[PDB]
Amino acid sequence: DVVNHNAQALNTLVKQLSSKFGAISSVLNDIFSRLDKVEAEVQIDRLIT
Amino acid sequence: GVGHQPYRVVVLSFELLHAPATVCGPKKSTNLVKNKCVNFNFNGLKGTGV
Amino acid sequence: WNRKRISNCVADYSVLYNLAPFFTFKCYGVSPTKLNDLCFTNVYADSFV
Amino acid sequence: IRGDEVRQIAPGQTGNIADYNYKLPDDFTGCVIAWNSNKLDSKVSGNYNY
């Protein structure tokens, strides 16, 4: 269990990057290459939060 | 009136998909760099990698 | 709606932008200043008065 | 300017006028006041001074 808890926590922390958190996409380069600054800096703000 | 005047309206719908693409912009392709860390732009997919 | 298939071609939106009969733009999901910097599979045009 | 070009003048917005004469910066905090000046600028058979 000591090994498995750390392995499961690291796997969960790795798999958490796929979530959008309300943004239109989970890819920062896609957001930056698709949108302007004034809304890119609130979509990336949501992703960073 | 201007609100009653006719308008030509065109809706353009694009397919931003994780798929092979046929329509691209005016900028063109450069030469390939292998086994070296560079910035890259593959069909709008931007990033930094080897 | 005459669904126009735009495919296998270079989309120059500066050609449409430089033309005089182009007054009101409103783009959703893609910033209109970056329409020349993306690639799409197929483009569908609909035109109506 | 001709009135349909003034909307180019914005932070980061493209266009020939805003690209080749003066660009507004991206962090620009400002105000834009425009008014039609036909009787002040437009003459008979055109005004070529602009």
PDB file of C-alpha atoms in Angstrom:
ATOM      1  CA  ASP A   1       0.000   0.000   0.000  1.00  0.00           C
ATOM      2  CA  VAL A   2       2.940   2.348   0.691  1.00  0.00           C
ATOM      3  CA  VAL A   3       4.157   1.811  -2.885  1.00  0.00           C
ATOM      4  CA  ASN A   4       0.665   1.804  -4.433  1.00  0.00           C
ATOM      5  CA  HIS A   5      -0.574   5.062  -2.862  1.00  0.00           C
ATOM      6  CA  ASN A   6       2.380   7.027  -4.259  1.00  0.00           C
ATOM      7  CA  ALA A   7       2.057   5.323  -7.659  1.00  0.00           C
ATOM      8  CA  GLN A   8      -1.689   6.061  -7.825  1.00  0.00           C
ATOM      9  CA  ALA A   9      -1.183   9.680  -6.716  1.00  0.00           C
ATOM     10  CA  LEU A  10       1.501  10.287  -9.355  1.00  0.00           C
ATOM     11  CA  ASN A  11      -0.663   8.641 -12.037  1.00  0.00           C
ATOM     12  CA  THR A  12      -3.617  10.842 -11.031  1.00  0.00           C
ATOM     13  CA  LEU A  13      -1.416  13.962 -11.113  1.00  0.00           C
ATOM     14  CA  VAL A  14      -0.160  12.987 -14.581  1.00  0.00           C
ATOM     15  CA  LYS A  15      -3.676  12.288 -15.888  1.00  0.00           C
ATOM     16  CA  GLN A  16      -5.018  15.593 -14.500  1.00  0.00           C
ATOM     17  CA  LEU A  17      -3.488  17.523 -17.432  1.00  0.00           C
ATOM     18  CA  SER A  18      -6.167  16.232 -19.836  1.00  0.00           C
ATOM     19  CA  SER A  19      -8.932  18.251 -18.152  1.00  0.00           C
ATOM     20  CA  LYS A  20     -10.050  21.528 -19.714  1.00  0.00           C
ATOM     21  CA  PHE A  21     -11.318  23.235 -16.500  1.00  0.00           C
ATOM     22  CA  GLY A  22     -13.869  25.163 -18.552  1.00  0.00           C
ATOM     23  CA  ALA A  23     -11.478  26.142 -21.339  1.00  0.00           C
ATOM     24  CA  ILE A  24     -12.236  25.323 -24.964  1.00  0.00           C
ATOM     25  CA  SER A  25      -9.107  23.158 -25.241  1.00  0.00           C
ATOM     26  CA  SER A  26      -6.477  21.614 -22.982  1.00  0.00           C
ATOM     27  CA  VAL A  27      -3.602  22.530 -25.334  1.00  0.00           C
ATOM     28  CA  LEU A  28      -1.939  25.846 -24.533  1.00  0.00           C
ATOM     29  CA  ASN A  29      -0.266  26.175 -27.933  1.00  0.00           C
ATOM     30  CA  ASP A  30      -3.624  25.525 -29.625  1.00  0.00           C
ATOM     31  CA  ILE A  31      -5.249  28.249 -27.492  1.00  0.00           C
ATOM     32  CA  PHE A  32      -2.417  30.714 -28.201  1.00  0.00           C
ATOM     33  CA  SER A  33      -2.362  29.965 -31.941  1.00  0.00           C
ATOM     34  CA  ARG A  34      -6.162  30.148 -32.238  1.00  0.00           C
ATOM     35  CA  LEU A  35      -7.219  33.115 -30.084  1.00  0.00           C
ATOM     36  CA  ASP A  36      -6.275  36.739 -29.405  1.00  0.00           C
ATOM     37  CA  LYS A  37      -4.447  37.968 -26.310  1.00  0.00           C
ATOM     38  CA  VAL A  38      -7.418  39.475 -24.447  1.00  0.00           C
ATOM     39  CA  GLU A  39      -9.247  36.119 -24.256  1.00  0.00           C
ATOM     40  CA  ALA A  40      -6.172  33.865 -24.407  1.00  0.00           C
ATOM     41  CA  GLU A  41      -5.111  35.420 -21.095  1.00  0.00           C
ATOM     42  CA  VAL A  42      -8.354  34.267 -19.453  1.00  0.00           C
ATOM     43  CA  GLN A  43      -8.411  30.789 -21.017  1.00  0.00           C
ATOM     44  CA  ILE A  44      -4.790  30.192 -19.963  1.00  0.00           C
ATOM     45  CA  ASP A  45      -5.746  31.798 -16.624  1.00  0.00           C
ATOM     46  CA  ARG A  46      -8.456  29.146 -16.142  1.00  0.00           C
ATOM     47  CA  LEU A  47      -6.020  26.368 -17.112  1.00  0.00           C
ATOM     48  CA  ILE A  48      -3.314  27.701 -14.758  1.00  0.00           C
ATOM     49  CA  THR A  49      -5.797  27.972 -11.863  1.00  0.00           C
TER      50      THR A  49
ATOM     51  CA  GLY B   1     -34.479  51.601 -43.897  1.00  0.00           C
ATOM     52  CA  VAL B   2     -31.044  50.127 -43.253  1.00  0.00           C
ATOM     53  CA  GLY B   3     -32.556  47.473 -40.994  1.00  0.00           C
ATOM     54  CA  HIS B   4     -34.954  46.638 -43.836  1.00  0.00           C
ATOM     55  CA  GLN B   5     -32.201  46.818 -46.462  1.00  0.00           C
ATOM     56  CA  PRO B   6     -30.989  43.417 -47.724  1.00  0.00           C
ATOM     57  CA  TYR B   7     -27.681  41.948 -46.568  1.00  0.00           C
ATOM     58  CA  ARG B   8     -25.380  39.382 -48.144  1.00  0.00           C
ATOM     59  CA  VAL B   9     -24.344  37.132 -45.245  1.00  0.00           C
ATOM     60  CA  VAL B  10     -21.834  34.290 -45.604  1.00  0.00           C
ATOM     61  CA  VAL B  11     -21.222  31.783 -42.811  1.00  0.00           C
ATOM     62  CA  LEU B  12     -17.878  29.990 -43.075  1.00  0.00           C
ATOM     63  CA  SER B  13     -17.638  26.803 -41.006  1.00  0.00           C
ATOM     64  CA  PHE B  14     -14.211  25.288 -40.353  1.00  0.00           C
ATOM     65  CA  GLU B  15     -13.258  21.832 -39.088  1.00  0.00           C
ATOM     66  CA  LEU B  16     -10.622  22.189 -36.365  1.00  0.00           C
ATOM     67  CA  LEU B  17     -10.015  18.457 -36.027  1.00  0.00           C
ATOM     68  CA  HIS B  18      -7.253  16.032 -35.036  1.00  0.00           C
ATOM     69  CA  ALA B  19      -7.282  14.802 -38.627  1.00  0.00           C
ATOM     70  CA  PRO B  20      -5.323  15.191 -41.878  1.00  0.00           C
ATOM     71  CA  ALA B  21      -5.965  18.621 -43.374  1.00  0.00           C
ATOM     72  CA  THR B  22      -6.223  19.996 -46.912  1.00  0.00           C
ATOM     73  CA  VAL B  23      -6.810  23.744 -46.391  1.00  0.00           C
ATOM     74  CA  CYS B  24      -3.840  25.786 -45.168  1.00  0.00           C
ATOM     75  CA  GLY B  25      -2.726  29.399 -45.032  1.00  0.00           C
ATOM     76  CA  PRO B  26      -0.422  31.500 -47.215  1.00  0.00           C
ATOM     77  CA  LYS B  27       2.711  30.663 -45.214  1.00  0.00           C
ATOM     78  CA  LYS B  28       4.632  27.666 -46.531  1.00  0.00           C
ATOM     79  CA  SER B  29       6.890  24.890 -45.264  1.00  0.00           C
ATOM     80  CA  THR B  30      10.607  24.973 -44.481  1.00  0.00           C
ATOM     81  CA  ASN B  31      13.118  22.116 -44.428  1.00  0.00           C
ATOM     82  CA  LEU B  32      13.017  19.312 -41.867  1.00  0.00           C
ATOM     83  CA  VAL B  33      15.347  19.197 -38.859  1.00  0.00           C
ATOM     84  CA  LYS B  34      15.924  15.821 -37.189  1.00  0.00           C
ATOM     85  CA  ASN B  35      17.580  14.815 -33.888  1.00  0.00           C
ATOM     86  CA  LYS B  36      17.846  18.425 -32.679  1.00  0.00           C
ATOM     87  CA  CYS B  37      15.716  20.509 -30.313  1.00  0.00           C
ATOM     88  CA  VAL B  38      13.739  23.082 -32.332  1.00  0.00           C
ATOM     89  CA  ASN B  39      10.501  24.997 -32.262  1.00  0.00           C
ATOM     90  CA  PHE B  40       8.002  23.451 -34.659  1.00  0.00           C
ATOM     91  CA  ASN B  41       4.652  24.154 -36.318  1.00  0.00           C
ATOM     92  CA  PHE B  42       2.998  21.003 -37.727  1.00  0.00           C
ATOM     93  CA  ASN B  43      -0.353  21.954 -39.358  1.00  0.00           C
ATOM     94  CA  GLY B  44      -1.075  24.566 -36.696  1.00  0.00           C
ATOM     95  CA  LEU B  45       0.269  22.302 -33.926  1.00  0.00           C
ATOM     96  CA  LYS B  46       2.940  24.534 -32.391  1.00  0.00           C
ATOM     97  CA  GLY B  47       5.510  23.583 -29.795  1.00  0.00           C
ATOM     98  CA  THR B  48       9.125  22.946 -28.845  1.00  0.00           C
ATOM     99  CA  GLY B  49      10.704  19.515 -29.089  1.00  0.00           C
ATOM    100  CA  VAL B  50      13.316  17.136 -30.418  1.00  0.00           C
TER     101      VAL B  50
ATOM    102  CA  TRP C   1     -27.956  27.310 -48.625  1.00  0.00           C
ATOM    103  CA  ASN C   2     -25.559  26.562 -51.462  1.00  0.00           C
ATOM    104  CA  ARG C   3     -23.052  24.552 -49.416  1.00  0.00           C
ATOM    105  CA  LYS C   4     -19.724  25.344 -51.060  1.00  0.00           C
ATOM    106  CA  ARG C   5     -16.930  22.832 -50.469  1.00  0.00           C
ATOM    107  CA  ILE C   6     -13.618  24.657 -50.021  1.00  0.00           C
ATOM    108  CA  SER C   7     -10.802  22.109 -49.948  1.00  0.00           C
ATOM    109  CA  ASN C   8      -7.313  21.347 -51.320  1.00  0.00           C
ATOM    110  CA  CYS C   9      -6.389  25.017 -51.698  1.00  0.00           C
ATOM    111  CA  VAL C  10      -4.535  27.862 -50.003  1.00  0.00           C
ATOM    112  CA  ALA C  11      -7.028  29.986 -48.055  1.00  0.00           C
ATOM    113  CA  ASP C  12      -5.932  33.626 -48.334  1.00  0.00           C
ATOM    114  CA  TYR C  13      -8.237  35.657 -46.103  1.00  0.00           C
ATOM    115  CA  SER C  14      -6.172  38.771 -46.848  1.00  0.00           C
ATOM    116  CA  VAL C  15      -7.633  38.610 -50.372  1.00  0.00           C
ATOM    117  CA  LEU C  16     -11.134  38.874 -48.893  1.00  0.00           C
ATOM    118  CA  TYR C  17      -9.946  41.431 -46.336  1.00  0.00           C
ATOM    119  CA  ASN C  18      -8.411  43.749 -48.957  1.00  0.00           C
ATOM    120  CA  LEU C  19     -11.680  43.792 -50.919  1.00  0.00           C
ATOM    121  CA  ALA C  20     -14.029  46.725 -50.352  1.00  0.00           C
ATOM    122  CA  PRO C  21     -17.359  44.722 -50.131  1.00  0.00           C
ATOM    123  CA  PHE C  22     -16.450  43.178 -46.735  1.00  0.00           C
ATOM    124  CA  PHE C  23     -17.958  45.160 -43.862  1.00  0.00           C
ATOM    125  CA  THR C  24     -18.925  43.189 -40.735  1.00  0.00           C
ATOM    126  CA  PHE C  25     -16.934  40.233 -39.369  1.00  0.00           C
ATOM    127  CA  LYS C  26     -17.699  38.105 -36.318  1.00  0.00           C
ATOM    128  CA  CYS C  27     -15.731  34.908 -35.696  1.00  0.00           C
ATOM    129  CA  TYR C  28     -16.396  32.243 -33.061  1.00  0.00           C
ATOM    130  CA  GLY C  29     -13.690  29.943 -31.705  1.00  0.00           C
ATOM    131  CA  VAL C  30     -10.969  31.300 -34.019  1.00  0.00           C
ATOM    132  CA  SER C  31      -9.539  34.803 -33.747  1.00  0.00           C
ATOM    133  CA  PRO C  32     -10.064  36.608 -37.094  1.00  0.00           C
ATOM    134  CA  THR C  33      -6.483  37.926 -37.095  1.00  0.00           C
ATOM    135  CA  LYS C  34      -5.147  34.338 -37.110  1.00  0.00           C
ATOM    136  CA  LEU C  35      -7.316  32.795 -39.872  1.00  0.00           C
ATOM    137  CA  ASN C  36      -4.267  32.756 -42.167  1.00  0.00           C
ATOM    138  CA  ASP C  37      -2.236  30.740 -39.624  1.00  0.00           C
ATOM    139  CA  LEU C  38      -4.335  27.559 -39.315  1.00  0.00           C
ATOM    140  CA  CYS C  39      -5.066  24.411 -41.305  1.00  0.00           C
ATOM    141  CA  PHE C  40      -8.476  22.761 -41.637  1.00  0.00           C
ATOM    142  CA  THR C  41      -9.721  19.548 -43.222  1.00  0.00           C
ATOM    143  CA  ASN C  42     -12.678  20.981 -45.162  1.00  0.00           C
ATOM    144  CA  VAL C  43     -14.315  24.415 -45.193  1.00  0.00           C
ATOM    145  CA  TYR C  44     -18.057  24.793 -45.782  1.00  0.00           C
ATOM    146  CA  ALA C  45     -19.436  28.098 -47.065  1.00  0.00           C
ATOM    147  CA  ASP C  46     -23.075  29.183 -46.923  1.00  0.00           C
ATOM    148  CA  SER C  47     -24.316  32.364 -48.585  1.00  0.00           C
ATOM    149  CA  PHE C  48     -27.705  34.043 -48.285  1.00  0.00           C
ATOM    150  CA  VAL C  49     -29.471  37.415 -48.561  1.00  0.00           C
TER     151      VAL C  49
ATOM    152  CA  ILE D   1      -9.247  58.098 -42.702  1.00  0.00           C
ATOM    153  CA  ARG D   2     -12.074  56.606 -44.709  1.00  0.00           C
ATOM    154  CA  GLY D   3     -14.454  55.568 -41.954  1.00  0.00           C
ATOM    155  CA  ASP D   4     -14.436  51.794 -42.462  1.00  0.00           C
ATOM    156  CA  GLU D   5     -10.664  51.564 -41.858  1.00  0.00           C
ATOM    157  CA  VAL D   6     -10.564  53.255 -38.409  1.00  0.00           C
ATOM    158  CA  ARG D   7     -11.682  49.979 -36.768  1.00  0.00           C
ATOM    159  CA  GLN D   8      -8.248  48.579 -37.691  1.00  0.00           C
ATOM    160  CA  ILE D   9      -6.633  50.917 -35.142  1.00  0.00           C
ATOM    161  CA  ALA D  10      -6.639  48.703 -32.041  1.00  0.00           C
ATOM    162  CA  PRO D  11      -4.220  46.681 -29.858  1.00  0.00           C
ATOM    163  CA  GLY D  12      -2.873  43.861 -32.014  1.00  0.00           C
ATOM    164  CA  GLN D  13      -5.433  44.190 -34.816  1.00  0.00           C
ATOM    165  CA  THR D  14      -4.075  43.670 -38.326  1.00  0.00           C
ATOM    166  CA  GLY D  15      -4.604  45.752 -41.457  1.00  0.00           C
ATOM    167  CA  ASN D  16      -2.495  47.678 -43.954  1.00  0.00           C
ATOM    168  CA  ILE D  17      -2.937  51.076 -42.258  1.00  0.00           C
ATOM    169  CA  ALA D  18      -2.191  49.817 -38.732  1.00  0.00           C
ATOM    170  CA  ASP D  19       0.695  47.678 -40.016  1.00  0.00           C
ATOM    171  CA  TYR D  20       2.400  50.215 -42.290  1.00  0.00           C
ATOM    172  CA  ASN D  21       1.811  53.585 -40.585  1.00  0.00           C
ATOM    173  CA  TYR D  22       1.446  53.095 -36.817  1.00  0.00           C
ATOM    174  CA  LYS D  23       0.609  50.123 -34.606  1.00  0.00           C
ATOM    175  CA  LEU D  24      -1.282  50.370 -31.357  1.00  0.00           C
ATOM    176  CA  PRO D  25       0.623  48.424 -28.662  1.00  0.00           C
ATOM    177  CA  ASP D  26      -0.852  45.336 -27.041  1.00  0.00           C
ATOM    178  CA  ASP D  27      -1.156  46.901 -23.556  1.00  0.00           C
ATOM    179  CA  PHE D  28      -2.611  50.158 -24.898  1.00  0.00           C
ATOM    180  CA  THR D  29      -4.966  51.987 -22.521  1.00  0.00           C
ATOM    181  CA  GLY D  30      -6.536  54.750 -24.552  1.00  0.00           C
ATOM    182  CA  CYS D  31      -9.594  56.264 -26.177  1.00  0.00           C
ATOM    183  CA  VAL D  32     -10.678  56.663 -29.805  1.00  0.00           C
ATOM    184  CA  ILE D  33     -12.903  59.580 -30.864  1.00  0.00           C
ATOM    185  CA  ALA D  34     -14.060  59.715 -34.487  1.00  0.00           C
ATOM    186  CA  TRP D  35     -16.469  61.950 -36.375  1.00  0.00           C
ATOM    187  CA  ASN D  36     -17.577  62.340 -39.991  1.00  0.00           C
ATOM    188  CA  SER D  37     -15.900  65.396 -41.533  1.00  0.00           C
ATOM    189  CA  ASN D  38     -17.433  65.703 -45.007  1.00  0.00           C
ATOM    190  CA  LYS D  39     -17.755  69.499 -44.847  1.00  0.00           C
ATOM    191  CA  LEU D  40     -14.238  69.797 -43.383  1.00  0.00           C
ATOM    192  CA  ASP D  41     -12.338  67.414 -45.689  1.00  0.00           C
ATOM    193  CA  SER D  42     -14.345  66.244 -48.713  1.00  0.00           C
ATOM    194  CA  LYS D  43     -14.271  68.637 -51.675  1.00  0.00           C
ATOM    195  CA  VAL D  44     -15.796  68.640 -55.142  1.00  0.00           C
ATOM    196  CA  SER D  45     -14.255  65.890 -57.340  1.00  0.00           C
ATOM    197  CA  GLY D  46     -12.386  64.367 -54.407  1.00  0.00           C
ATOM    198  CA  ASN D  47      -9.727  65.356 -51.887  1.00  0.00           C
ATOM    199  CA  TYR D  48      -6.380  63.836 -52.878  1.00  0.00           C
ATOM    200  CA  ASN D  49      -4.391  65.391 -50.010  1.00  0.00           C
ATOM    201  CA  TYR D  50      -4.960  62.358 -47.749  1.00  0.00           C
TER     202      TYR D  50
END
